[PDB]
Each structure stands twice: as C-alpha cells, then as structure tokens.
C-alpha cells in the first residue's frame, strides 16, 4: 500500500569487460566431439558486443529474454564453441535426438542460456574439402548433458572381436564433414556459441 519513493541499484564496482569478443572471433573453432568450453567470470557482461557481429542464423535464448541480458547477474557463465552443419543447428536445443545431440553435444532439459549460430562458409570451407572438422557417429550409449567424449577407440559393429585394426566390421567413430563452398546451406559450416548461465 505504501508506495516506493526511490529506486536504488547496487552492483559491484568492477569495470572489466567480459571477453565475448575473443570467443566470437577466434580464428580456429573446435570440432563438435571436442568442443571448447570457456569460463566467463569476474567481469562486466555487456551483451551488445555480440550484436555487432554477423547476422545470425539462430539467436535462440531459452529461459531468458535476449533483450534483458544487460539487466541481470549470473553465477556461472560458460561459452561453448564448435562447428556443425546447417541442418543440425536446430539439434542444439533441449529435448533433441540425432547425431550431434546424442553423441557429440547434449543440452539439458532444464537449460538456461542462449544458442547463437552463424554461417561460417568463408572461414571454414575449402574447394577440395575441409577435413579438419569431425563428428562422432558411433557410440555405445547416448551422452549425458555437457559430457565431452574425445575417444578414438575402434568401434566394433559385429559379433566378431576387434583388436584396434579397422577391418571387416571395425570402424572409427569419427567421420569428417568435408566442407565445400559448392554445398548447399544445410551442409555449409556453421559456428555455434552456446552461452550457459
């Protein structure tokens, strides 16, 4: 009933800006089986540094508004960077099933934060094929959320025993993308940064 006569704001008195710029314009991004996680802490998080980058294919925020991110404080900030195809961008979401979500990068169901994905054909394609980007397509079980698997063990698909040599039914789990500029936009390379709060 008694109305407030004044509004006070008490934030900590630090002036260091958060290094979102170093996440977003790194020269080499990681593969999706070995994605890069950077901890962001003890800084002022200005989110307009993200907005002066490329027109994004996806800027989808879950559990938070994208226009209110300058008004909030966060406990633990993580930035996860990798490179995927264009038809797997929707698979970086809560409650998804496929190859990137099941075997490479799993998001939790109770996920808060943003998924920012932009086209990077200019940076990560070669005309003969860019074979430096890999994904895992063979694994015994689905991944837990935020579990990284960097194993290169030779996977057996038959009833025969397998002794580390890729022979009749023995396959390596890592398949390359082979990115080309002659591909369509669903097979072109896309750089994904996932901000987790």
């Amino acid at each position: 009933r008694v109305q407030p006569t004044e509004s006070i704001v008490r934030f900590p008195n630090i002036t260091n800006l958060c290094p979102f710029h170093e996440v977003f314009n790194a020269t080499t991004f990681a593969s999706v089986y070995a994605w890069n996680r950077k901890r962001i802490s003890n800084c002022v998080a200005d989110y307009s540094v993200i907005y002066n980058f490329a027109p994004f294919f996806a800027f989808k925020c879950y559990g938070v508004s994208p226009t209110k991110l300058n008004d909030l404080c966060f406990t633990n900030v993580y930035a996860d960077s990798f490179v995927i195809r264009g038809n797997e961008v929707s698979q970086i979401a809560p409650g998804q099933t496929g190859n990137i979500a099941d075997y490479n990068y799993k998001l939790p169901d109770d996920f808060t934060g943003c998924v920012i994905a932009w086209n990077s054909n200019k940076l990560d394609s070669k005309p003969s094929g860019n074979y430096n980007y890999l994904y895992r397509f063979l694994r015994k079980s689905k991944l837990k959320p935020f579990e990284r698997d960097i194993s290169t063990e030779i996977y057996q698909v038959g009833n025969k025993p397998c002794n580390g040599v890729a022979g009749p039914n023995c396959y390596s789990p890592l398949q390359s993308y082979g990115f080309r500029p002659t591909y369509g936009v669903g097979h072109q390379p896309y750089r994904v940064v996932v901000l987790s709060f």
């Epitope: 490329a54 086209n119 200019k122 940076l123 070669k126 005309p127 003969s128 002659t182 072109q188």
Partner: antibody, heavy 125, light 103 residues
Framework: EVQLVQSGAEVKKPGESLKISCQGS????????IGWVRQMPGKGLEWMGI????????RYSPSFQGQVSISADKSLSTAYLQWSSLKPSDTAMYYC??????????????????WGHGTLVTVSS | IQMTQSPSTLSASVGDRVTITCRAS??????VAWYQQRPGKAPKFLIY???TLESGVPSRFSASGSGTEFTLTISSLQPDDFATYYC?????FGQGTKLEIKR
Amino acid sequence: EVQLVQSGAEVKKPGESLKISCQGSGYSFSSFWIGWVRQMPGKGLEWMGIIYGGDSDTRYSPSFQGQVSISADKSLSTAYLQWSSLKPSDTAMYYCARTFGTYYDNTEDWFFDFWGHGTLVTVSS
Amino acid sequence: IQMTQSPSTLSASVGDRVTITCRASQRIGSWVAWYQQRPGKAPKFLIYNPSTLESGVPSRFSASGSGTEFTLTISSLQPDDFATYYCQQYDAFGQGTKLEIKR
C-alpha cells in the same frame, strides 16, 4: 552451368565516373568470392581485388587501394567495380571471375575457375 | 610474392609435349593455377590440383610443383592450344608464355 555476365563496353571522358556490373548465375552467389582482373592492351593480367558475396568482405591489392571501389548486391546476385574520377591510364579489359580459397592462408586454392567475358573501358578526351 | 614464367615465347608443332615453368620469389604452397588465353577471348582455367580432375575422362594437362618451381605440361597440342598461358596463386600473375606454331 556457372555463368558470369558483364556489362557492355564503355567509352568515357576523363574525370567521369563509372560502375561496372557482374551478374552470376548457376551457383550460390553468397558462398563464393568475385574478383576483378584488369588487362591493359598488349599486357598481362593484374589482380585488383576480391569481394565475398555474403557479407561484402572486400580485399584490395595495394596497387589499387583507393583508386577503385568494389561493391556487391547479393539480392541481385551481382558485383560492381566503380571509379570516382576516370584517368586515361584506365583503358583496359576488365574481367570478373569466381574464386574461393582459405581465409587465413593466401597460398591455398585461390584460383579463378569461372570467368566473365570481359568489358572494355576506354578513356580519352 | 612475384611469379616469373621461364619461357617467354616457345615454338612447337601439332602433336608434341610442351613443358612450361613458373617460379615464385618466396615459398608458396603445393600448387599454382594455370590459365589459357586465346587472343580476343577470356582466360580459361586449366588446372590447380590434378587430383580434382580425376574423372572418367583423362586430362590432357598435367602439373607438378615444389615450393618454388612449378610446371605445366601439355601432352598433345591441338591447334586450339596455341595461346598465352598464365600462372597465378593469390594476387601475383606471371607474365604470359605464348605458344607459336613452328614452321
């Protein structure tokens, strides 16, 4: 079939302005670079500059920076080469061409696989 | 980077093997691009990597290259193969090697 169609031949007075178009068809224009190559009469090919069709990222040669301007319109799937003030040493055949290479490595695959037919620009009083 | 073609004008007849050479100033990558320009026509791209043109139809043009010396070899010459040839990597074009018929 990947095709590049340029504008017609130009006869200009010195001091005038000129813009030259290059329209691409048969390919995704936003996934490739378009470069401009001049050829003086009786002379060889000279690299002038490249532009990427997606976000208009432009690299110029150091012998052509400030003399020319290279632009692109990805909605019309075209690229432009433009002078501000024309000189009589700009009498040349100008080719647009399609290329794609590594961004941070200049020594990997920066080849012009498809070429335009060329425009002829003559400047004389 | 400066690229210099070692024959300036070469003479050959119809049906021979022609080797032309392009050398760089500094060290560049594994291959260079080769172009053929008839007089009055646009340049036509011939070869960068010989593994790219490994289709069912065999290729008339072959190419070899170290870090400095590069070589384009035409195994058999048609009358349409007497033109001006250029080597290029990124922004450096070599000066042209012109093939003339020999009589």
